[PDB]
């Protein structure tokens, strides 16, 4: 098995928000079978970022999700070849972010090639005004469509001025080789920025994720 209890992460994100380019790189580690990971991110270009860093965090790998034996694990199956994903994040005020991640594996280190592009964020909105606090925990709904895996989730950012800012995620996951497709299921998530410096030039990011096949 290429999936070990402890694995590394290396990534580079190039992107733009409202037409302003930036780039960020990261290094991390996680426990695939425990559905836990953490990483240190460093802004390489476009700093200091003029937008809420939180819109980027869920873009910085479902392989890091605890899948019980009774649920087909589309992600761990995909390796060593790997998989890629595409996603559109539709914020309630019209801001729209498109992102992609092509994930490969070199030894015990997952490598991510990420692209991020957000547009139409209002200048006086919580994103450009940097009023976000964190993403609330969530439950992603995963289902198969036309031979590939889809994942949708209702996300919400708590705001400093109180209340929440909603966004709808629609992700498509594509393995780079034929793998068994899972039945309809869920993945609970909780992403958190544990630390960061003044302008988010440096960010420590963690995520906790577990799948389950029944709710009620």
Structure explained in plain terms:
- This protein has 216 residues and is mainly beta.
- It has one domain: Beta Barrel (Green Fluorescent Protein).
- Helix content is 4%, strand content 57%.
- It contains 2 helices and 12 strands, in the order βββααβββββββββ.
- It has helices spanning 54-57, 74-78, and strands at 7-17, 20-31, 36-45, 83-91, 96-106, 109-119, 132-135, 138-145, 148-159, 164-175, 185-196, 202-212.
- The protein has an 11-stranded mixed beta barrel.
- Strand 4 and strand 5 form a beta hairpin.
- The termini are far apart.
Alpha plus pi helix count = 2
What proportion of the residues is helical, as a percent range? Answer: under 10%
Tertiary shape: globular
Give the name of the CATH architecture: Beta Barrel
> Could you say how many structural domains there are in total?
1
In total, how many beta strands? 12
Structural category:
mainly beta
PDB class: fluorescent protein
Keywords: GFP-like Protein, photochromism, fluorescent protein
Assembly: monomeric
Entry title: Crystal structure of a photoswitchable GFP-like protein Dronpa in the bright-state
Give a brief description.
With 216 residues, the chain is mostly beta strands. It contains two helices and twelve strands; from the N terminus they run βββααβββββββββ.
